[PDB]
């Protein structure tokens, strides 16, 4: 039940 | 001019992987090498469909790395799984040890993270010397540069199964729960939607990590 990636750091 | 039959261990006729414009990688054959301008270009005929002229950072060998030959920062292609498998580029973030259960941690070019086995990754043939410099997403490029250069200094938070924290995702801080710890990753359940994400335990998307990094004296 995967969420799409949010990457490695918070959104700028 | 500048046609070559070989460039070191790259030989016309070898099996190879090439990067397509979709950012997925596909098996083919190296059909030509040519010196153009400042370097070499590599012509790949794909098994399924198409031909491409590629730079050396956009081809990978069709074999799996021997034990112990990759390093933190190595540029690789790795299996990405959704239900379906695709090959996507990334960077080695951790090499096999028992506590990661002898897997490689991969930070993919889009910021996704996963552990993969030795038989799930392929080495890129001619990476850039600073391997992150061909990462298109500037926020992932910057993160990788910081991570690789600081390694092995990796501040992480200790999280336990069942712990409740806020986790950032796309600009919002969401109520979330720690489901599982696996080496340097934590499986976070976002409570609003009940979907999970594996996140690096040193990521400032995890509020305890954000809090620690933001503090200062
Ligand atoms: Na260093």
Numbering used by the authors:
A (entry chain B): 7 to 18
B (entry chain A): 189 to 271, 273 to 406
Would you copy out the relevant sentences from the publication that reported this structure?
SETDB1 (also known as ESET or KMT1E) is a histone H3K9 methyltransferase that generates H3K9me3 in euchromatic regions. SETDB1 contains three Tudor domains (3TD) and a methyl-CpG binding domain (MBD) in its N-terminal part, followed by a split SET domain, which harbors the catalytic center for H3K9 methylation. We show here that SETDB1 3TD binds to histone H3 tails containing K14 acetylation combined with K9 methylation. Crystal structures revealed that K14ac recognition occurs at the interface between Tudor domain 2 (TD2) and Tudor domain 3 (TD3).
To understand the molecular basis for the recognition of the combinatorial H3K9me/K14ac histone mark, we solved the crystal structure of 3TD in complex with an H3(4–19) K9me2/K14ac doubly modified peptide. The three Tudor domains compose a stack, in which the individual domains interact with each other face-to-back. The histone H3 peptide lies in a groove formed by TD2, TD3, and the linker between them. The specificity of the H3 peptide interaction is determined mainly through (1) recognition of K14ac by an acetyl-lysine binding groove between TD2 and TD3, (2) recognition of K9me2 by an aromatic cage in TD3, and (3) binding of G12 and G13 to a narrow groove between TD2 and TD3. The K14ac is recognized by residues from TD2, TD3, and the linker between them. The acetyl group forms two hydrogen bonds with the backbone carbonyl-oxygen of G300 and the backbone amine of Y389. The side chains of F332, F296, A302, and Y389 form hydrophobic interactions with the acetyl-lysine. The K9me2 side chain is inserted into an aromatic cage of TD3 formed by W358, W363, and F379. A direct hydrogen bond between the carboxylate of D382 and the ε-ammonium of K9me2 appears to further stabilize the complex explaining the preference of this aromatic cage for binding of K9me2 over K9me3. In addition, the backbone of the histone peptide forms a series of hydrogen bonds with the residues from TD3 further stabilizing the complex.
